[PDB]
Design a binder for this molecule. Sequence first.
Ligand SMILES: Nc1nc2[nH]cnc2c(=O)[nH]1
Ligand SMILES: Nc1nc2[nH]cnc2c(=O)[nH]1
Lengths: 216, 216
Amino acid sequence: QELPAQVKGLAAHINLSLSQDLAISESLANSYFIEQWVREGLPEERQNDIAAYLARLMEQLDTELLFIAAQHQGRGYYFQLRNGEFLQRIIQPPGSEDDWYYHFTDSDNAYELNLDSDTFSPDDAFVYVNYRSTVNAANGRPLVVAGAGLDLSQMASLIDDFRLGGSGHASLLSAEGELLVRSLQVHEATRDGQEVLVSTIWLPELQRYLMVEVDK
Amino acid sequence: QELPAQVKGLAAHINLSLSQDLAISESLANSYFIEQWVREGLPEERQNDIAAYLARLMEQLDTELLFIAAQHQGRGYYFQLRNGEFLQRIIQPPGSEDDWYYHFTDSDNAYELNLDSDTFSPDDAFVYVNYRSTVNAANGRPLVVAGAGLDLSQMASLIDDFRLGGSGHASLLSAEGELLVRSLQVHEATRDGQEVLVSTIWLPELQRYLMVEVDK
Ligand SMILES: Nc1nc2[nH]cnc2c(=O)[nH]1
Ligand SMILES: Nc1nc2[nH]cnc2c(=O)[nH]1
């Protein structure tokens, strides 16, 4: 049976791409230079530097968004490099859209992959790689929560990266059944028109399932 | 046949570990802060900072050695964090042991995994993750060549990480037959005493082959 092993290998491909992104996100969240920039009071004079730094990562990871959420004097600051623009704002109280932060920082997870609409542009939704810094602020929250906001179209192109015979559909869903993107125990099911074979597997790094259809 | 697929999966495990190391090495070689420290003339005043920075990576990658080779005014400087010590020296001409540099910088490879004896301590030999910076100096050489020096004992523990049935031996060799470490088309060969099954596969990221023996 080539199809099950092929599904496992493609899942491994997705895993290694996300793992490169995750390692870079951890190194960014625990960056000594970013922590020193935070302790210095986040001077605007060095912002350009910071931008360049994040640029060097965006070129390597090919991700649309890069974000840094810093804590200083009890205030949270959200910075984002995207499309050459370096945007900055203040993190909102838990009653607004930034409650995700209060979520991830209240969980004991070192990292989570939460899908959410962008706070600078609510129209676009991204898959955010929230990684927590080892250092904690005086209020108990992570000093830095940095990572990469992935454009879901890329998600579509890297699952469309490999196709079995050039046909079939590959889908990636969430744990509640919310579908994220579209291009072990294998089963056979009759689809509308013609029958197909389906087989699913769950990714722990993404917290999310993966299905695939194949005909002849 | 479970053994071939198991060999492929363990090779994938080795690949993903080395890939985390490689991504961190690339981000370090193309670090904007390191490049600014180089352009500033490599001030000793900031050395502590640099050290801390590299420390933050060594804690994440669990690698014995971290190295940075910088170019400034036509002179090459070799820095290494290891065991809490921040060592620094001048890169030797091609007639000495640093010729590896002139090798890797003369190849069009973005990165190479060269095994070599340490230049600060010739007794210990490491597997060096040489990654080239995108920026080039005025003399045409990479402005920064940074990465991680892996202790081969770790290499032994991550191939001993997974064992089939708790028996058998897994070996990793070079392209000339030089064995690196010890714990597709499968073949059967009679070893001294009792017969065994052997199957090998080549890793492109490591440029190196992988064998494995199994009895019953
Ligand atoms: N909306 C939103 N923006 C983010 N920026 C970083 N992480 C997130 C997240 O989870 N949601
Ligand atoms: N000896 C030695 N030291 C290194 N430091 C970084 N790369 C190397 C290498 O290839 N050889």
